[PDB]
Design a protein around this ligand. Sequence first.
Ligand SMILES: Nc1ncnc2c1ncn2[C@@H]1O[C@H](COP(=O)(O)OP(=O)(O)O)[C@@H](O)[C@H]1O
Ligand SMILES: Nc1ncnc2c1ncn2[C@@H]1O[C@H](COP(=O)(O)OP(=O)(O)O)[C@@H](O)[C@H]1O
Ligand SMILES: Cc1cn([C@H]2C[C@H](F)[C@@H](COP(=O)(O)O)O2)c(=O)[nH]c1=O
Ligand SMILES: Cc1cn([C@H]2C[C@H](F)[C@@H](COP(=O)(O)O)O2)c(=O)[nH]c1=O
Ligand SMILES: [Mg+2]
Ligand SMILES: [Mg+2]
Ligand SMILES: [Mg+2]
Lengths: 210, 210
Amino acid sequence: ARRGALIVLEGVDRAGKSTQSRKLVEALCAAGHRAELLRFPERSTEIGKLLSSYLQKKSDVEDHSVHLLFSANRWEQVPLIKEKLSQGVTLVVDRYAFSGVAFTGAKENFSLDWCKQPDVGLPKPDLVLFLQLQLADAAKRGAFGHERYENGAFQERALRCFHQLMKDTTLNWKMVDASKSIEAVHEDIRVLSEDAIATATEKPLGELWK
Amino acid sequence: ARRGALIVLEGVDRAGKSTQSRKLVEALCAAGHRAELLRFPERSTEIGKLLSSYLQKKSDVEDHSVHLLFSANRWEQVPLIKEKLSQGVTLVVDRYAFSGVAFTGAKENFSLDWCKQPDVGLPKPDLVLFLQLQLADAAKRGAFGHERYENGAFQERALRCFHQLMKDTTLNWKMVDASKSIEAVHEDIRVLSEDAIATATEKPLGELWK
Ligand SMILES: Nc1ncnc2c1ncn2[C@@H]1O[C@H](COP(=O)(O)OP(=O)(O)O)[C@@H](O)[C@H]1O
Ligand SMILES: Nc1ncnc2c1ncn2[C@@H]1O[C@H](COP(=O)(O)OP(=O)(O)O)[C@@H](O)[C@H]1O
Ligand SMILES: Cc1cn([C@H]2C[C@H](F)[C@@H](COP(=O)(O)O)O2)c(=O)[nH]c1=O
Ligand SMILES: Cc1cn([C@H]2C[C@H](F)[C@@H](COP(=O)(O)O)O2)c(=O)[nH]c1=O
Ligand SMILES: [Mg+2]
Ligand SMILES: [Mg+2]
Ligand SMILES: [Mg+2]
């Protein structure tokens, strides 16, 4: 009956969202929690394959259409998310609706309001971690990628959108200094996550942006 | 330079949306207009096939996800719609965003506001025809179908949603008595359409619900 927590990891490019989400699930399970990992986009579904082809530049998709497919890709996982949480399983998610708004919101003539609407009503995270890293430190972690959106100019506009989203006080945002070592960042994230898991059993799962 | 008009046909089940859209395009072209037919859902695209499988009950899709796919299926045709209109081609469309809101809006716990958002900003129709028919007269036109949403209880909830949408004065709604003969309904629609085509060359294409 004691529900699991919904924990989201957001963050700048190469700050370590995927490395930290994997390590968090491993550590929680080793400490006796029931925890599982999710990511968005979830490329395994029918909509997920359309999204993967788009990000790889194997296909072009009209900007509004692709924004709605990224949102639909979250909604198709909502029945699973609510089932797992109600069963006491904590979910750790590598990117969520915040990345959806920030990446479309970085394109010309896309307001933050329009971008948020499709995701209104999704399961509300109990904890949103944002992994911060200065661009000099990110550069040492590798060269850009060949997927769509992998260029500094675009990443910088998405970052401004993320800062606008962080003003929303309906959400439990926590900043994480992702400039430290893999292990030191993990310990900071893990302690914040243990606290969130404990309190989530106290209030019902909320709805995002409503 | 004289743009074409965007004309939408909406209406109750079996009122004749598809019969009248076909006959309208044929008559406009015979009278010297450049006119072409479109329909939604457009089942030929990747998203269109997902939608067709859902309507045929060959697959189940989560309600929010399917609502966003119906909207994305309109946005993927926006570059074509704007190109055609700018080239002076009038477009006659069998269903549009109004059916999108009314059909999802008929399901439990779906507000009209949430349903409208994804379609905010689409090309705004210059003329929205709504084909009205009493349920007794519809029954004589055949038996229900085996596709999703083909049942009187659901169609009745969608009808209430359409009436809420008709209160919006930003749109040029025209009621059509679809109880007459195929030819008499066509003449009423055709005369309204000739008037709309003439004035559309006067004002820029608008944006829906904004
Ligand atoms: N704290 C860290 N210090 C040094 N390298 C890191 C750190 N976190 C991640 N990395 C490395 O940087 C790269 C990007 O990490 P990744 O977790 O894939 O980031 P994201 O998912 O945020 O793009 C990987 O090679 C990873 O091993
Ligand atoms: N005015 C009308 N009078 C009689 N039958 C009609 C009329 N309009 C359409 N029909 C018939 O009713 C059926 C439904 O028409 P259709 O155009 O497919 O409706 P919709 O697309 O609105 O469901 C078809 O068999 C069609 O021939
Ligand atoms: C969830 C989500 C991710 N992205 C983008 C962000 C990024 F460029 C890309 C691949 O994500 P990973 O970096 O996590 O591989 O997908 C979007 O553009 N919208 C979304 O809704
Ligand atoms: C455009 C549109 C149509 N429909 C529904 C309405 C109907 F039951 C179905 C098939 O449409 P046709 O009746 O025009 O075949 O699809 C929706 O549910 N949402 C939409 O956005
Ligand atoms: Mg990653
Ligand atoms: Mg039809
Ligand atoms: Mg609003």
